[PDB]
Structure formats: structure tokens, C-alpha cells
């Protein structure tokens, strides 16, 4: 996260760290959506251009974390993966269309002050809140600058951007399964996701029921915090029927 701040304790209790077993290193962010299911970006697990194709046994998820590098004894919980599910139409060849994946945990995680699931949006909450200028919140342990790494989880609030501005900012083909967010050059304020924040959540607090909803997943961009560039996020609601199909069938 570039130009963010340190998270408060318990501020993002759905945050998940995807962690490689060997070498032990951070792979991506992710989010807790129930006691057994974690949501992330497909490119965190499968990206053939970079020779990335992880299997369940390669990975752990670490839940309840604040510090990036510490083992947070009596606070974080570490879970093994039962199964990875990648969207069947995830487009790793072109533009990361449908950049979404689910991970089922081997055992349910116990909720605590530090571990709690985020809601997924319904159609009406998405329609109300996914509007240009409305702000969401992005969290992660990724890089602090494009070209280092944080002691603790970072947080930044960013406005959703009008679709024509998103389209006009890049040569990559945008789809309805994406939205973009960030400040414009003339808005002065700054902030962005960066490499290592992949797969983490873009959340909004509904003003109707005072609950947090995950509207996006950190997906792609060009550089970090560049003027005139915006971060792109997987549109969770647009892909929710697939999420529900997977959870109903498997779970």
C-alpha cells in the first residue's frame, strides 16, 4: 500500500495473508468470508506468464495478523488448504478478467477479536455503493512504493472512479468484471495498492446497516500511485453467482 497508514488493531479482522511454505514468504492478501472459505485473486495462485501455479500443499493462510513478519503468538491462526477453486473463465492470457479464486480451509477457523468475516454484497448494496466518488478501503502488507515493506498492515481509503476515466487511463482492455479506484491528479491526495497487496479486499461500510462489504479484490494496475493511473479491482458482486455455486457445491 502506497501513501496509506498503519491499521488499527482489529480494523480489518477479515484480512488474510497467503503465505508460501518454502521459502517462507508472503504471497498475497486475501479475505475471510466464513469460517471455512477465503477469497483471493486468481493471479495469486495461477499466472503462467510468471511460471506461477500453486497447489494446496504449497500454501498456508494466516488469519488475524497485524505485523507483517512476526509470528503473532496467541493472536494469529494458521490454516492449511483443503482445495483451491479458480474461476473457470479467469483470463490470465490477456487482462486478468474474472480475477477471483476461493480457498477452502481444512478445518474451520475460530473467530476472535482479531478474526471475523466480511460480508459479500447483495445486488442492491452494490448498486447503491459502486458509484464514482464513493470511497472504499484497501488493506495489505505489500510494497510501500513502486520502486520498502511495512512493519504492520497498511490501510488506504480511495474513491471509485468513473468508468470512462478508468478506460482512458490504460491500454489494457477493461471489462464489466472490474472497476478502478484512486485519486485523480487534480485531487491532490494520493494512495494505491501495490505488488504484494494482490488478492486483498476493497471494502465499503454500508451506511444503511453499518456492516462492511467486500466490493473488490486487488487485481492489477501499472506502477503504484502514478499520476493518471488507477488500481483495478475484481468486481465481487458481478462474480457472486460463481462464488455461491462453489460454496453450495463444495461446502
Amino acid at each position: 500500500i502506497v501513501e496509506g497508514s498503519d491499521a488499527e488493531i482489529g480494523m480489518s479482522p477479515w484480512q488474510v495473508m497467503l503465505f508460501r511454505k518454502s521459502p517462507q514468504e508472503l504471497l498475497c492478501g486475501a479475505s475471510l468470508i466464513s469460517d471455512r472459505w477465503v477469497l483471493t485473486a486468481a493471479h495469486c495462485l495461477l499466472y503462467p506468464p510468471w511460471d506461477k501455479n500453486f497447489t494446496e500443499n504449497d500454501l498456508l493462510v494466516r488469519i488475524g495478523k497485524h505485523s507483517r513478519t512476526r509470528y503473532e503468538r496467541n493472536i494469529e491462526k494458521i490454516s492449511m488448504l483443503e482445495k483451491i477453486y479458480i474461476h473457470p473463465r479467469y483470463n490470465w492470457r490477456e487482462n486478468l478478467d474474472r480475477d477471483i479464486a476461493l480457498m477452502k480451509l481444512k478445518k474451520p477457523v475460530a473467530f476472535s477479536d482479531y478474526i471475523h468475516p466480511v460480508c459479500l454484497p447483495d445486488r442492491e448494496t452494490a448498486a447503491s455503493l459502486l458509484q464514482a466518488g464513493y470511497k472504499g478501503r484497501v488493506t495489505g502488507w505489500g510494497n510501500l512504493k513502486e520502486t520498502g515493506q511495512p512493519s504492520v498492515l497498511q490501510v488506504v481509503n480511495l474513491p471509485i472512479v468513473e468508468r470512462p476515466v478508468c478506460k482512458d487511463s490504460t491500454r489494457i482492455r477493461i471489462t464489466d468484471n472490474m472497476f478502478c479506484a484512486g485519486y485523480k491528479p487534480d485531487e491532490g491526495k494520493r494512495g494505491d495498492a501495490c505488488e504484494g497487496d494482490s488478492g486483498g479486499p476493497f471494502v465499503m461500510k454500508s451506511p444503511f446497516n453499518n456492516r462492511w462489504y467486500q466490493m473488490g479484490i486487488v487485481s492489477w494496475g501499472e506502477g503504484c500511485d502514478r499520476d493518471g493511473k488507477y488500481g483495478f479491482y475484481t468486481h465481487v458482486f458481478r462474480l457472486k453467482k460463481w462464488i455461491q455455486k462453489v460454496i453450495d457445491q463444495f461446502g
Binding site: 503465505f19 511454505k21 517462507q24 514468504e25 508472503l26 498456508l60 494466516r62 513478519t69 512476526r70 509470528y71 494458521i78 492449511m80
Partner: peptide, 11 residues
Amino acid sequence: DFEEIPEEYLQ
């Protein structure tokens, strides 16, 4: 880098 995690989680 990262603090070693308990061996139980590494199988």
C-alpha cells in the same frame, strides 16, 4: 525476513 512459524503448520 519472516519469523519462523511453528513446525506443526509445516506438516
